[PDB]
Amino acid sequence: LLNMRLRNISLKSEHCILSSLDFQTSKASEQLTKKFIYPQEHNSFLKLNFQEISYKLIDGTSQIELDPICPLKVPLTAFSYDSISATFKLVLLPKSTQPHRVKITLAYELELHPNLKLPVRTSWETSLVNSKLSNVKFKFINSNIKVIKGEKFTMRLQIINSSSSPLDLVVYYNNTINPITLENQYQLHNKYRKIAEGIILLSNDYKIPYFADLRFIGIMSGYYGTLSGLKVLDLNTNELIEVGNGASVLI
Amino acid sequence: VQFEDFTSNEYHVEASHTSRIIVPIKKIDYKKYNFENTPIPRIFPGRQFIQSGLNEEQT
Amino acid sequence: PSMDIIPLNELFSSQVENVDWIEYVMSKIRAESNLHSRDFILLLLDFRNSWIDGIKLN
């Protein structure tokens, strides 16, 4: 009851799990000792944090937070350090320790020493594109990695089949503006114009019969997230499924 | 195609075709060499059916 | 056996100026200093070979 602490954990699925604890000043405790401090002629507190440490709770383990920290002391404030976890596959809720050491202060003496440790479980918990018919999974072998400079480049759509008639389908890009609150008309028009006119796909109806190369050229700039347009089409009626994947800044 | 000193030109096989690359080689002199020794096996463990079913001239 | 036509918007840069059409449009726009782009549209022909050897295709 001097410094309220909370830990927030965010699940970055393309990397490690990120969890950050957060100290604060706990105002419902500050006016308490503010009353006696301004009784003794002091305006704000001088609590000194001298040893702050998060340890990985286990039989025994410890971690290290993902940037640098000094030995600090603040009056009415909040601080928050971040430490990276390891992104679990399924069903193992890890736990942490989070010890701390607040050192209070008085007139060059009477440093009433305090310490605190709140151990709890660090599990807040709130690119394969499947075919959705017969598990013909597609993945780009270098997705989201392309700094092109309006030059040619090549990608790799590694199709993974049932190995049962593995020669079936054809890619294409569809350079055509799709035909679609008036600025909601205009934002959709600018999105559909920059999609259907910015890159070209130099191997158009490539008719793949399990890698591909798919050379593009890319004649306008801007971050093309999710790279729409690049559809495939297969032996059945309409397997017009997307890739929905891969991105390229072009500057 | 690289031989021990012969290096060929740059051909072009397109999709399913054959292209006969012609390589020179000299003959191999019989009196300078020996060609009547048994080719060795890798192992020295197994008996390998040591009664080998072969004659002289077939070997 | 298809056809498509696509406009042009980026002026481009000198270090990539080695493929034929961008050095053509840049070289054409070194003079005539009123046009920059949006007037040099770009048509996409797609040659297909129904034969049994390579061809060189100017």
Curated annotation (Swiss-Prot), chain A:
Hey, what's the signal peptide range on this chain?
Answer: none
According to the record's subunit comment, the protein's assembly and interactions are: Part of the multisubunit TRAPP (transport protein particle) II complex composed of BET3, BET5, TRS20, TRS23, TRS31, TRS33, TRS65, TRS120 and TRS130. Interacts directly with TRS120 and TRS130.
Q: What else is known?
A: Present with 1660 molecules/cell in log phase SD medium.
Q: Which residues of the full protein are shown?
A: 212 to 559 of 560
- Please describe what this protein does: Specific subunit of the TRAPP II complex, a highly conserved vesicle tethering complex that functions in the late Golgi as a guanine nucleotide exchanger (GEF) for the Golgi YPT1 GTPase. TRS65 plays a role in the YPT GEF activity of TRAPP II in concert with the two other TRAPP II-specific subunits TRS120 and TRS130. Involved in cell wall (1-->6)-beta-glucan synthesis.
Q: Which domain of life is it from?
A: Eukaryota
Where is this protein found?
Cytoplasm; Golgi apparatus, cis-Golgi network
Q: What is this protein called?
A: Trafficking protein particle complex II-specific subunit 65
Curated annotation (Swiss-Prot), chain C:
Task: Report the superkingdom from the record.
Answer: Eukaryota
The listed locations are: Golgi apparatus, cis-Golgi network
Job of this protein: Specific subunit of the TRAPP II complex, a highly conserved vesicle tethering complex that functions in the late Golgi as a guanine nucleotide exchanger (GEF) for the Golgi YPT1 GTPase. TRS120 plays a role in the YPT GEF activity of TRAPP II in concert with the two other TRAPP II-specific subunits TRS65 and TRS130.
> What does the subunit section of this Swiss-Prot or TrEMBL entry state?
Part of the multisubunit TRAPP (transport protein particle) II complex composed of BET3, BET5, TRS20, TRS23, TRS31, TRS33, TRS65, TRS120 and TRS130. Interacts directly with TRS65.
Please report which protein family the annotation says this sequence is part of: Belongs to the TRS120 family.
- Other observations noted: Present with 259 molecules/cell in log phase SD medium.
Q: What is this protein called?
A: Trafficking protein particle complex II-specific subunit 120
Species whose genome carries this gene: Saccharomyces cerevisiae (strain ATCC 204508 / S288c)
